[PDB]
Amino acid sequence: MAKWVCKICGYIYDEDAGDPDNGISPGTKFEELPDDWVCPICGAPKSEFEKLED
Ligand SMILES: [Co+2]
């Protein structure tokens, strides 16, 4: 699946890994993350992520 980078801290949201420590199962698309999910490292909102693709 796709990977997204936090433009603040460099955390990679890997859709294949999800974010289970914060309620997100592996395989959850970025678009499907709750609106108020934040970067688990720096706390940045979803707005600050960019998808890693051309
Ligand atoms: Co971050």
Curated annotation (Swiss-Prot):
Residues where Fe cation binds: 6, 9, 39, 42
Residue ranges constituting the Rubredoxin-like domain according to the UniProt record: 2-52
GO MF annotations in UniProt: electron transfer activity; iron ion binding
Keywords: Electron transport, Iron, Metal-binding, Transport
Example of a GO biological process term: alkane catabolic process
Temperature-related activity annotation: Extremely thermostable, being unaffected after incubation for 24 hours at 95 degrees Celsius.
Cofactor-binding details, from the entry: Binds 1 Fe(3+) ion per subunit.
Cofactors: Fe(3+)
Pfam families referenced in this protein's UniProt entry, alphabetically: Rubredoxin (PF00301)
PROSITE patterns per UniProt: RUBREDOXIN (PS00202), RUBREDOXIN_LIKE (PS50903)
Function: Rubredoxin is a small nonheme, iron protein lacking acid-labile sulfide. Its single Fe, chelated to 4 Cys, functions as an electron acceptor and may also stabilize the conformation of the molecule.
Stored NCBIfam families: RubredRD
Entry's family note: Belongs to the rubredoxin family.
Protein name in the entry: Rubredoxin
